[PDB]
Amino acid sequence: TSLKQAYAQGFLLGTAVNADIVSGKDAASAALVACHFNAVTAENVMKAEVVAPRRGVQDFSAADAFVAYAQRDRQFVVGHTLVWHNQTPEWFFTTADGRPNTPAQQLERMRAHIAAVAGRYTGKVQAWDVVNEIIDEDGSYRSTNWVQRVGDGDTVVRNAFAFAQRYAPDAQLYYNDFNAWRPAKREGIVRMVKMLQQAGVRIDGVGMQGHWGLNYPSLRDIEDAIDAYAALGVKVMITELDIDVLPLTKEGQIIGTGMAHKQFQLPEFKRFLDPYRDGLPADVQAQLRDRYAELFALFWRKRDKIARVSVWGVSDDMSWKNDYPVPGRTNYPLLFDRNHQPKPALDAVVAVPSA
Amino acid sequence: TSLKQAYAQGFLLGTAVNADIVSGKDAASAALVACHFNAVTAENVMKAEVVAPRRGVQDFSAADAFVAYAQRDRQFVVGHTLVWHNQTPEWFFTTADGRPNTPAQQLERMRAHIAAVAGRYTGKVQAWDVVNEIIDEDGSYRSTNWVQRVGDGDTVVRNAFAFAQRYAPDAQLYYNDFNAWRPAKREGIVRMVKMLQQAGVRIDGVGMQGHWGLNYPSLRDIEDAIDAYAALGVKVMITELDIDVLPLTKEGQIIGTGMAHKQFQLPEFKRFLDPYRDGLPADVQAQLRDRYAELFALFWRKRDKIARVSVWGVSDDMSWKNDYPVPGRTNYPLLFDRNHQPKPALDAVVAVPSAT
């Protein structure tokens, strides 16, 4: 009957929560969270640009509210995220005098931030996304702000997990990335985890972001990924699951701000890229059902290798996929609709465990 | 029967020719040009970066070849682009000592360039795209390198067409743009033409580029566009016609370098964006045939207000739409295939003026 109850024997079944769920303002959603989920990940309020926006300033207010909220409702608290190239202010990568950070100054900035964030929520937050999205599509390290300023991809990852181990020794430490099903990217993640383990550094599991669609990815890629990770003696998790149903975006995951271009808001593109403003049609609503069904059928079959599955939101209006990568669209990615009612996709998902 | 022959009593029927058709290397295309087309536009060799690559340097050799090429069949010679924000080197907009040009210094660079290009081809070039793409989608002037350096949008167009009139008095002067079917942009062009007419500056025609697709734009928007430009007393032309048949880009025209991102080369996107890597399926060929048919039917119904319909190439294999907006794709935009055979669309286009 309930998502967390039906999947109780398999894995934790969680969701992302925004400020409005945590504040109580979104009453309808917060009610669904307590009913259906046993893990919460703070959508945004734990990122570095909210936590330490400028030099000399801190803001833990919203994150403190999130942690307290989860404990109150008995949730498996997941912090997200400690070290990430996006949503991290310019001052993290420069000295007070404007100079780009030396390898030592960059790691000190990493150490201090982890100690500030993870060290604050010891015993309260159970799991940390330590490094988020550092591997490229070819499997190598991404030339990101962190990687450039430190100077070595292996060094960035290795230190972040060691700092998290020091300042939150109680907490599980996860690597989290998108397109973790891609063979070339997968082999890179394995490589990185294997260097962490032989270094003696702690890492509890790899999180597959699961930001997928109707026509991607293949179950082969997903299964082969879950296998490849579990074989390294670490947990596997689907951490931010949603199913994009709109044109173009259902075909593959898009990054960057190219789709945010002014030109795609023009009528001819508006009328193609956002075709479901009046509502989701019977057949596409059925597709979304079948797609969720086959994926959870996979997760439940592989239940021994998966510690947690989380949807990146409760109701469709909450979703980041309405305004990303194309602002102003009406997407239908999650398991509950805009009236907070169950979607025919949910009924299938709850059926999977007993099926 | 040929295109020019069928469309003789309606408008000139032209094509874009590359350096290869001109050099005689692409002889297969060359023969089709001599066969079907009575007007020609150089695809690239007359643009700024070619004819004036560096400060104090000129390369008119490849353009010279294009004009000489156009003599053997006596085509209507269209010079492609005098003032345009793209394919124009950054030295055009700066002094020798690095500083950005003053309004007066930028207008001089315009004058000296036009004199060198348009003045060089008097009696030989019949028409000029004087200004290419200056109006934005909302109708206002684009904040281009020319516009910023001159300081004002109206001054760019006013001077460009004035200098063109001076150094090429014989030539017909056009404004050329994409999306020229869009109401907001249409009004911006109409506004711009009116301003030129009130200032007594010469302008002869509005060219709708016509880089279109299967799902865009509506015949109505095209028709309202033709009507509006004709009521100004100028000539209307379809200047760079092609029909995009591949996903996403059959829905609307894309500009910029967004789709040049590594991510659209990844297997899941190439799968979606490039589905016809071994010929067009039957259902889509007919869709292209039907698209070209209904469009040329419009042009022919509105032939009195139209002066020229130019397709932007001969055979698909050299079409810019293959590598733009997404590189490494196989597109089918034109009227002849990669073996220079007539595509079903050609026969539909040729039949249009005879159709009952």
Chain A interface includes B216 (CB < 8 A): yes
User: What is the experimental method?
Assistant: X-ray
Report d(CA B83, CA B91) in Å as an integer: 14
Of A156, A178, A349, the C-alpha closest to A255 is A178
Nearest CA in chain B to A248: B248
Report d(CA B318, CA B330) in Å as an integer: 10
Report d(CA B157, CA A155) in Å as an integer: 56
- CA diameter of chain B: 65
Chain B interface includes A325 (CB < 8 A): no
Report d(CA B294, CA B351) in Å as an integer: 11
Chain B interface includes A252 (CB < 8 A): yes
Question: Residues of B with CB below 8 A from A143's CB?
Answer: none
Report d(CA A307, CA A117) in Å as an integer: 24
Residues A161 and A134 sit within 8 Å (Cβ to Cβ): no
Nearest CA in chain B to A138: B266
Question: Residues of A with CB below 8 A from B254's CB?
Answer: 263
Of A253, A259, A236, A84, the C-alpha closest to A179 is A253
Task: List the beta bridge partners of residue A132.
Answer: A84, A176
Report d(CA B192, CA B228) in Å as an integer: 13
Three-state SS at B19:
helix
Q: Amino acid identity, residue B40?
A: V
Question: How many Å from the N-terminal Cα to the C-terminal Cα in chain B?
Answer: 18
The first and second tokens of residue A158, run together, are 């290795």
Question: Residues of B with CB below 8 A from A248's CB?
Answer: 248, 272
Q: Determine, for residues A248 and B272 on separate chains, whether the beta-carbon distance falls below 8 Å.
A: yes
Question: Residues of A with CB below 8 A from B261's CB?
Answer: 256, 258
Q: Determine, for residues A252 and B268 on separate chains, whether the beta-carbon distance falls below 8 Å.
A: yes
H-helix or E-strand containing A108?
helix A103-117
Describe chain B by its helix, strand, coil percentages, rounded to 5.
45, 15, 40
Question: Residues of B with CB below 8 A from A254's CB?
Answer: 263
Q: Between vectors from CA A105 to CA A101 and to CA A107, what angle results, nearest 5°?
A: 110
Give me the residue from B251, B256, B266 closest to A269, CB to CB: B251
Report d(CA B29, CA B315) in Å as an integer: 7
Of A133, A322, A102, A136, the C-alpha closest to A239 is A133
Describe chain A by its helix, strand, coil percentages, rounded to 5.
40, 15, 40
Of B173, B259, B237, B162, the C-alpha closest to B201 is B162
Give me the residue from A251, A258, A272 closest to B268, CB to CB: A251
Q: Determine, for residues A272 and B217 on separate chains, whether the beta-carbon distance falls below 8 Å.
A: no
Report d(CA A12, CA A60) in Å as an integer: 27
User: Which structural domains are found in chain A, ordered by start?
Assistant: 1-355 (3.20.20.80)
Chain B interface includes A272 (CB < 8 A): yes
The first and second tokens of residue B190, run together, are 């109409």
Residues B212 and B206 sit within 8 Å (Cβ to Cβ): no
A264: distance to nearest CA of chain B, Å?
9
Beta strand segments in chain A, E:
12-17, 39-42, 76-79, 83-84, 127-132, 172-177, 205-208, 211-213, 235-244, 306-311
Q: Determine, for residues A268 and B252 on separate chains, whether the beta-carbon distance falls below 8 Å.
A: yes
